DNA sequence: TATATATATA
DNA sequence: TATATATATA
């Protein structure tokens, strides 16, 4: 559910 | 002769989402909301189906779901890959908050 | 050990 | 500036950079061309490729002396058997040798 | 998947 | 010679 890379 | 692929996309595009290290991810772009800390110029808040994840990425990794399916859309053993297909296709609205 | 090309 | 050319005649025993389409030079032995074989095409020269012992022939324009062209090509490659070709160049160039 | 590292093209 | 592609290797 977050920030890729 | 060759169709350029897009340089602008708006809230609600669904697309093929190239990161490094990934293959091309089922995706979709989200809306910017104003009132936001402003993003990098060019560069669009993606959400990736599947893993539900974000990043922001530009047009140059960005291909448009429909015309790129074919080349992309094959199954994949990274984790939420096979998910991420099915929710493009079946609920490409999860989270979608643009409209 | 075999021919190359 | 005047440019010193490269062999145009090699003997068996010779260490050379071989070079061939797609891979890169790659140290090797001029073999031997026994007598009683079958003849060569003119002007090719039975080659013998350190670290995959594999074997062609080739001429003179894809052929390099070994030591004065070893500083350019003598440098580290991953293509497969390579490296382990840098080290028999060196330490056991006469693998498999019939020549002398 | 990506990086090396070849060749072909302009 | 400088660029863009295809193949080999990690």
Redesign the interface.
């Known amino acids: 559910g977050g920030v890729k890379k | 002769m060759a169709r350029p692929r897009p340089r602008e996309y708006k809230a609600g595009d669904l697309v093929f989402a190239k990161?490094?290290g990934y293959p091309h991810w089922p995706a979709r772009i989200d809306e910017l909301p104003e009132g936001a800390v402003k993003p990098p110029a060019n560069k669009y808040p993606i959400f990736?189906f599947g893993?539900?994840?974000?990043?922001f990425l530009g047009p140059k990794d960005l291909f448009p779901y429909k015309e790129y399916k074919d080349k992309f859309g094959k199954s994949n053993k990274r984790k939420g890959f096979n998910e991420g297909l099915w929710e493009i296709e079946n609920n490409p609205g999860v989270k979608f908050t643009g409209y």
Chains 1, 3 share one sequence.
Do not use: S
């Open positions: 990161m490094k990736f893993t539900h994840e974000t990043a």
